[PDB]
Structures are given as structure tokens and as C-alpha cells.
């Protein structure tokens with residue numbers, strides 16, 4: 001029958017909705033997260049379409065020769081201050097289901113910034129977006145629960161600082177960080193830590209910890225940008241990269 005011939009072809013057309021480079025990535029971030037829970041609880045390739053659909057997030061490969069690739073690769077390495085070599089492997093356009101509509105694009109000062117995260121967090125981040133940390137009020141607010149700015153979402157403009165948070169995964173030793181449009185708004189510059197910040201100071205939309213220099217000493221080794229409402233973040237790219245000074 002011809003009806004049967006058409007359904008088998010639609011299965012082909014379904015499985016092809018997933019580039020090989022994107023299936024391989026979805027495998028790795030899933031592998032990394034399963035390897036991590038196995039470890040704290042006791043311990044080509046066929047298109048793994050099932051795992052990608054659960055992320056409710058669209059991931060496209062930008063080809064390593066595209067015009068888009070060389071431009072984005074330039075912007076990541078643009079403020080690489082510690083010139084310890086980095087090999088930018090792959091770049092993926094990204095789009096969360098609800099992110100493009102909830103985004104507060106109308107604040108102004110929308111700037112593209114870097115958020116690093118260990119590889120096991122990537123499944124969580126792609127399914128739910130970048131989440132605010134949980135405030136602590138059952139006990140004394142230690143230095144282990146907050147960052148240097150308070151309970152917010154942290155970005156930098158420098159690959160040198162995002163490499164401090166983009167820890168290499170156990171699966172392949174590659175590092176991931178996101179590129180996100182961040183609606184900064186009115187941005188208060190800070191020179192001293194504040195761990196009590198649950199929101200931006202009055203009249204401002206975000207806060208910026210200013211990195212120490214020989215002229216101006218502050219409490220910040222790195223430039224830190226923090227926002228306090230999740231819909232000031234729109235993820236735009238995943239960057240797969242690797243540090244040569246990781247081997248041997």
C-alpha cells in the first residue's frame with residue numbers, strides 16, 4: 001500500500017530534524033548529568049531524538065565556517081585577558097520556548113554577556129532557563145550560599161572570568177558557557193561586596209561589580225554583572241570550548 005510508504009518516510013523526516021552535531025551535544029550534556037547522579041548515588045550513533053525533545057529548547061549548529069561562527073567566536077575571545085590558549089570548538093544557536101516573549105527587552109542597555117556553568121547544569125539550564133538562587137533565612141547567611149553580590153543571576157563580559165565557572169566535564173573534557181542577552185537597564189556600579197542583595201538597589205535594574213585596578217581598588221577580581229529578575233535574560237548561544245592547558 002502507498003499509505004505505509006508515506007509513514008516510514010515521515011519517520012525519516014522526523015529524525016532528520018536533529019543535526020548530528022546537535023544529537024552528539026544532547027548526548028553529552030545528558031551523559032554528564034547521568035554520570036553526576038550515578039556518582040552521588042552509587043554508580044555515528046542513532047538519533048537520540050527523545051532526549052532533545054525533553055529540553056523544550058531549540059538548538060541549531062552554526063557551521064564552523066559560517067559567517068555567524070567567525071563573528072560569535074570573535075566576540076567570545078574579544079575580552080580574553082589572560083592569554084592562556086582556548087580552542088573554540090562548536091557554537092549553537094539556542095532558543096527557549098518562553099524566553100523570547102517574557103524577555104524585558106524594553107529596559108534598554110541590552111548587552112550580550114557570558115555565563116559559565118559546569119556541564120552537568122546545562123540540561124537544567126536549557127529546560128528552565130537561568131534561575132535565581134534560593135535565599136537563606138532559616139540561618140545565618142554564610143559566604144557559601146551567595147555570590148559576592150547577593151541572590152541574583154551572574155554574568156561577565158570576559159571569557160577570562162567565565163572560564164573560572166565553566167568547569168570541564170568528565171565526559172569529554174570540554175567546557176560550555178552560554179551567551180545571553182541581558183537587559184541591564186540602569187546599572188549601579190559597585191566597588192564593595194553586598195551579600196544581602198535580593199534585588200537591584202532602588203531606581204536601578206541591575207548592578208555591576210567593578211574589577212580592581214592599580215588606580216581603583218575594589219572588592220572584585222573580575223567584572224560581575226548581576227540581574228535579579230529572570231526575564232532579564234535571553235539565552236542566545238552555547239559555546240563548546242577547551243583549554244589546551246588541561247591535558248597531560
Ligand SMILES: Nc1ncnc2c1ncn2[C@@H]1O[C@H](C(=O)N2CCN(CC(=O)Nc3cccc4c3CNC4=O)CC2)[C@@H](O)[C@H]1O
Nearest residue numbers: 114115116117121124125128129130131133147154162165
Ligand atoms: N535552570 C538551571 N539549571 C541548572 N543550573 C542552573 C539553572 N539556573 C541557574 N543555574 C546555576 O545556578 C548557579 C547559581 O545560581 N549560582 C548563584 C550565584 N552564583 C554566583 C557566581 O559566582 N556566579 C558567577 C559570577 C561571575 C561570573 C559568572 C558566574 C557564573 N557564570 C559566570 O560566567 C553562584 C551560583 C549558577 O552557577 C547557574 O549555572
